[PDB]
Amino acid sequence: MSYADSSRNAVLTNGGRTLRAECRNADGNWVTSELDLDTCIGNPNGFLGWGMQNFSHSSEDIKLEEGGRKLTCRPKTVDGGFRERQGIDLNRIQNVNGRLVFQ
């Protein structure tokens, strides 16, 4: 499962590379935390996945599809800005005690 299991109102901040949502902490409170996926997600070749970084630099129209369980964007080659559209699931982004951390 992803942070969304116990988190709501997931939006795209910092242009669309950071996940901002209300993470329900153990105390039962909704704390707004942000995790930068641009550090572990990349798509300079036009393909999305975990490993490379700075995907925002090679993608357009970055928005969450499954309300936060998946991030959809069009990975475009930086060589010109042409490519294909795609989407990557964010099942690696977890929320521990209300703190959003990459796992």
DSSP, residue by residue, 61-102? EEEESSTTSEEEEEEB-TTTS-B--EEEE--SEEEETTEEEE
Taking the C-alpha atoms of residue 16 and residue 30, their distance in angstroms, rounded to an integer, is: 22
CB of 77 within 8 A of CB of 44?
yes
Q: Which residue is listed with tokens 């042409």? A: 82
Taking the C-alpha atoms of residue 100 and residue 32, their distance in angstroms, rounded to an integer, is: 9
Domain with 26 in it: 1-103
How many domains is the chain built from? 1
Helix %, strand %, coil % of the chain (to 5): 10, 50, 40
User: What is the total residue count of the chain?
Assistant: 103
Question: For the domain that residue 19 is a member of, what is the CATH number?
Answer: 2.30.60.10
Indicate left, alpha or beta for 82 from its phi (over 0: left) and psi (-120 to 50: alpha). Answer: beta
Taking the C-alpha atoms of residue 92 and residue 49, their distance in angstroms, rounded to an integer, is: 11
- DSSP one-letter code for 43: -
Taking the C-alpha atoms of residue 19 and residue 81, their distance in angstroms, rounded to an integer, is: 24
Q: How was this structure determined?
A: NMR
